[PDB]
Amino acid sequence: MNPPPPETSNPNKPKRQTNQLQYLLRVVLKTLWKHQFAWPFQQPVDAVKLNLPDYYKIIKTPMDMGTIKKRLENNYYWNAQECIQDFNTMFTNCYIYNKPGDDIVLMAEALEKLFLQKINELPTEE
């Protein structure tokens, strides 16, 4: 079975709208989302349709860009580090689950290269 997805709404979590979080949406997420290799990462892993019955046995902190996009658009975060951590969790899960050198690993690596280039110029907090 699939687990419930990660949380994207929690009214008692305190929230901020900040220039670093705006950059994470307008620059980081949008750059990765439009990439030709984004599609596997645009929603939670569907272990049923993809026939991955061991995925959620191995991966206990699932994360994906559909979840991150919702978190950014719905102002779920307090700070940029929370969102950066979500991207890094997504990449790590892919590398942990998959056989080294598989297509999905090359896809994650291409997105991660762009992620790192954009994070390198995360603006100073205003």
Ligand SMILES: Cc1cc(SCc2c(C)noc2C)ncn1
């Ligand atoms: C090309 C492709 C797509 C997918 S989508 C499912 C997926 C993701 C995302 N991370 O690990 C797996 C497995 N899997 C393999 N190969």
